[PDB]
Amino acid sequence: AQLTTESMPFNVAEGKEVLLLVHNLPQQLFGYSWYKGERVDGNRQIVGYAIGTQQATPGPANSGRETIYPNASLLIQNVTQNDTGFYTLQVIKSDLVNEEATGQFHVY
Template sequence: RVFRAAGQGEGQLPRVSLLTFWTPPTTARLTVETVPPLAAEGNDVLLLACNVPENPLGYAWHRGERVDNSQLIASYRVDTNVTAKGPAHSNRETVYPNGTLLIQNITQKDTGFHTLLVSKVDLETEGQTGHLSPHPLGCIITSNNSRPWEHKDTVVLTCGAETRNTSYTWWINNQSLPNSTRLELSEDKRTLTVFTVTRNDTGPYVCEARNPVSVSRSDPFTLNVLCE
């Protein structure tokens, strides 16, 4: 049995109605990303403005979760390339033309929310908040070999995590490093290499990390040198 649509003759194709649906593209929302996500006191941090609206008129950064003129860090006008400092500016902040905020030498006082307000061409504004949580400058000695053999193995001791703007100092047996061809510091002094260890190299070793806003000293570290 053959069914024909109304008005359909023999050999004719049925009329088909096609409905085309168009979905407008989704606009990515403004976000703020902290780079690096974990930073020690004394380091520099970027509050990266992502998915900024096209052709913005300007930016304004505030401390806290609310837009409060008394907590304005700085504002930036795109057309004039001019930055105006606010009451909360500490001479460590820079606003870039893409809306990103640089904070240098972060301290615990920088902990908390920072809010970006973007002024758009339609005279409306869009805001987003980022969070900054500096961690104290840590200092722990680690070794590449926990059980070195005497007169055979070389040991590399490392002081804490790698951070910028940080200087390092070492002590052995509560004294400064002696002049020895078997002891070698890296260029940044963060690592200490002990060549062909002996039983006299057990330590204890202590290192100190220091940056413009923080100082941290490690617990004593002792090598367990194995002897034949």
């Protein structure tokens, strides 16, 4: 069940919200981090959430409209142009075998 990332909508009006859904959260997962872009780059982390600690720590890419949910779903509010593009999600697991899985959305 390979971790997938439908965005709702795909094509988002400026000022409207978009919600990145996640469909196959594994078991024995320690947490999720969202990144802006295609690769999992530290400099470009949106936010992480450890489920045990149940604590989400904004990364350097956070704009304070994201509200990450415990089901790994994101939700970016009041979107504008620079949001457009890809968003890798990584899920790190107890045994340190991780799962990248990227989604998209385009703003008009």
